[PDB]
Amino acid sequence: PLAKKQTVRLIKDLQRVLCTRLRLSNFFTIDHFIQKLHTARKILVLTGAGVSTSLGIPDFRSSEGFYSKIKHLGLDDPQDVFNYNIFMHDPSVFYNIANMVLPPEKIYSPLHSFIKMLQMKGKLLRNYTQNIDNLESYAGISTDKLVQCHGSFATATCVTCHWNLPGERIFNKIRNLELPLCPYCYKKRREYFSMSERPPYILNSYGVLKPDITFFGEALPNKFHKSIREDILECDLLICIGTSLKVAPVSEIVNMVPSHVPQVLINRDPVKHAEFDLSLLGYCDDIAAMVAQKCGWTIPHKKWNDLKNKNFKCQEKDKGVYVVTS
Amino acid sequence: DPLAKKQTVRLIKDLQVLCTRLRLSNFFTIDHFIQKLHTARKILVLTGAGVSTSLGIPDFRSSEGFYSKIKHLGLDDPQDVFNYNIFMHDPSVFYNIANMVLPPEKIYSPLHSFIKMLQMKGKLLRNYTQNIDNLESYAGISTDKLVQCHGSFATATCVTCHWNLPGERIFNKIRNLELPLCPYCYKKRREYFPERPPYILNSYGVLKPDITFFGEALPNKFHKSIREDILECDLLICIGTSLKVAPVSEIVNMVPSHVPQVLINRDPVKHAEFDLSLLGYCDDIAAMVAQKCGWTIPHKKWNDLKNKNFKCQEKDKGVYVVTSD
Ligand SMILES: NC(=O)c1cccnc1
Numbered sequence: 001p002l003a004k005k006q007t008v009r010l011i012k013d014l015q016r017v018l019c020t021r022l023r024l025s026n027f028f029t030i031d032h033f034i035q036k037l038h039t040a041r042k043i044l045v046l047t048g049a050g051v052s053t054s055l056g057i058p059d060f061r062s063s064e065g066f067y068s069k070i071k072h073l074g075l076d077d078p079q080d081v082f083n084y085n086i087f088m089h090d091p092s093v094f095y096n097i098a099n100m101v102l103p104p105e106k107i108y109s110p111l112h113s114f115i116k117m118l119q120m121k122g123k124l125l126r127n128y129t130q131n132i133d134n135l136e137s138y139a140g141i142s143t144d145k146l147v148q149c150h151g152s153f154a155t156a157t158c159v160t161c162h163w164n165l166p167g168e169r170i171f172n173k174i175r176n177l178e179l180p181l182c183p184y185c186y187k188k189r190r191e192y193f194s195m196s197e198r199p200p201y202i203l204n205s206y207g208v209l210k211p212d213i214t215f216f217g218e219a220l221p222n223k224f225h226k227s228i229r230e231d232i233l234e235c236d237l238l239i240c241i242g243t244s245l246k247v248a249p250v251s252e253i254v255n256m257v258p259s260h261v262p263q264v265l266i267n268r269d270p271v272k273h274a275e276f277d278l279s280l281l282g283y284c285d286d287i288a289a290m291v292a293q294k295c296g297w298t299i300p301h302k303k304w305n306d307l308k309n310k311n312f313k314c315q316e317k318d319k320g321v322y323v324v325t326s
Numbered sequence: 327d328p329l330a331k332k333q334t335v336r337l338i339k340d341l342q343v344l345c346t347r348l349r350l351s352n353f354f355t356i357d358h359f360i361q362k363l364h365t366a367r368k369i370l371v372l373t374g375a376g377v378s379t380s381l382g383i384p385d386f387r388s389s390e391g392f393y394s395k396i397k398h399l400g401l402d403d404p405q406d407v408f409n410y411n412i413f414m415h416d417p418s419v420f421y422n423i424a425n426m427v428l429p430p431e432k433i434y435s436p437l438h439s440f441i442k443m444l445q446m447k448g449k450l451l452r453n454y455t456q457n458i459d460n461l462e463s464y465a466g467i468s469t470d471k472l473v474q475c476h477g478s479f480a481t482a483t484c485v486t487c488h489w490n491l492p493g494e495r496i497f498n499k500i501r502n503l504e505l506p507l508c509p510y511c512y513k514k515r516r517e518y519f520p521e522r523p524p525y526i527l528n529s530y531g532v533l534k535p536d537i538t539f540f541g542e543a544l545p546n547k548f549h550k551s552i553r554e555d556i557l558e559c560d561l562l563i564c565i566g567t568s569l570k571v572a573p574v575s576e577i578v579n580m581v582p583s584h585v586p587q588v589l590i591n592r593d594p595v596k597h598a599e600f601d602l603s604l605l606g607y608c609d610d611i612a613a614m615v616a617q618k619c620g621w622t623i624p625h626k627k628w629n630d631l632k633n634k635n636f637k638c639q640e641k642d643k644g645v646y647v648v649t650s651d
Pocket residue numbers: 049057058059060065066067069100101102
């Protein structure tokens with residue numbers, strides 16, 4: 001069909017009406033996925049918070065998730081706490097809740113390992129992750145193969161002078177609900193808290209350090225667009241895992257990838273606004289094991305003995321859709 | 327250049343923001359245009375009604391244009407006489423005015439011949455025209471090279487049964503302000519329009535000329551051609567149009583960003599970013615260009631035009647006002 005180029009906005013936003021992607025006639029099964037796995041050389045793996053919940057890290061949207069906790073505190077719109085423009089206006093909104101999102105460290109799931117597997121077999125084009133928990137590097141995913149789409153707490157930057165430090169340096173202030181302040185800006189900040197130097201032209205974010213996670217309304221890290229420009233030209237399988245796919249531009253990856261490329265979902269819930277070729281509905285750690293196993297592969301993670309020794313049930317439930325339990 | 331995804335172009339005629347195109351840094355003089363004409367092999371020319379005003383045919387929105395001559399109708403939007411929903415509901419609204427848009431025959435302007443000139447030098451990839459006057463044929467522009475984006479009176483079609491006939495078979499009815507009726511639907515038509523159910527529209531068994539109405543799909547040659555042409559185009563020249571109707575007005579967004587885009591038109595096109603804009607009458611600016619290229623426009627008015635002195639006054643970077651005296 002006739003098309004022109006529509007610029008993909010690179011500011012983090014709710015994506016939020018039929019999807020127009022057409023599903024491949026030739027690719028619906030589990031066995032189709034398996035043969036593709038054996039032949040593919042340039043797999044794109046797109047992950048979300050689902051791939052870290054086996055580790056006790058909440059996701060965003062589910063019943064025990066972050067949004068539910070922020071709402072229970074009393075915020076009318078819990079989305080507010082990760083809003084960039086809100087941060088720039090009032091950084092206490094985010095720093096009032098930031099201790100809740102500071103991640104654990106040095107752990108990873110069977111899924112992160114299934115990703116490293118692909119890398120080791122020379123098949124991973126990129127893992128585009130939405131997660132700010134920074135668990136991919138520890139899991140062994142190489143830095144050239146990882147795109148932290150929405151950043152991480154690895155570093156924090158002053159919004160005023162752009163001085164950058166390791167995130168760890170501000171964790172104790174975050175645990176104690178204290179505003180992390182830039183040491184270089186601090187003297188002007190005290191002066192402010194000339195017309196241009198007074199209310200309303202100086203914002204409350206003046207000289208405040210912000211973790212280098214991407215907020216809603218902020219530009220994604222440059223690694224994202226630079227990578228996807230190229231990975232789009234060459235991807236030959238797309239797997240989406242442990243995400244609702246509600247945040248653009250990450251959510252647009254499904255539309256940017258060329259239409260002949262097979263797209264697979266592994267997730268607890270179907271993604272209604274997308275048209276995956278194959279959907280595998282269940283726990284990602286379980287479905288990973290199952291898939292590796294059908295492939296005659298192993299997942300280099302401790303839990304693999306155990307996961308591999310289960311009885312997996314794959315119930316067809318409409319074409320190209322399986323409910324996987326065990 | 328910005329990371330992009332594919333967006334389907336809507337193929338329904340629609341009267342049409344900000345423009346995203348970046349102008350070429352190395353192309354903004356008249357000499358850049360002359361040099362490019364020498365080397366280009368796959369030129370897309372997009373025309374509108376300004377290419378026939380020299381022949382005495384009104385354009386649409388000038389002060390003596392078609393919309394000015396139907397002011398007495400008192401329409402909120404005078405384009406409604408060419409609206410498709412209006413046609414389907416009540417074809418007498420179009421048929422009152424259709425006589426005014428029947429084409430003359432066997433005449434064409436120096437700008438039409440400039441296009442044919444390009445053709446016979448092997449440089450015309452396509453002439454996308456919005457005109458229904460069919461004058462490109464008379465000028466020698468080939469059917470293969472012509473896309474009548476908004477159709478023509480060549481054929482007419484029954485809106486009910488789809489019977490297709492030569493468009494000239496309805497001209498005498500058009501001239502008499504009568505509805506041209508389909509001979510196959512006529513028996514049912516006469517039953518309903520001597521009981522009639524409320525879901526039978528007034529267009530039942532009415533012939534429609536195969537011009538594209540506002541709200542109607544474009545002819546199939548348009549999307550078939552443009553898809554291939556934007557891959558090969560090496561120069562776009564937009565002439566005698568306000569560029570206010572989509573999807574034609576999207577051609578300038580669809581051509582890849584590196585292809586030079588030139589406007590030749592009485593007025594700037596404020597919602598587009600042309601690399602070079604030449605502002606004046608088509609025929610004169612075509613002649614001046616052909617002169618500068620050391621070329622000949624194959625038109626009886628060539629000897630008159632080649633005898634004019636053209637002044638090109640640079641207004642802004644890539645904007646020139648071209649007059650004659
Ligand atoms: N509890 C949270 O707010 C949270 C933590 C980690 C990931 N997602 C959400």
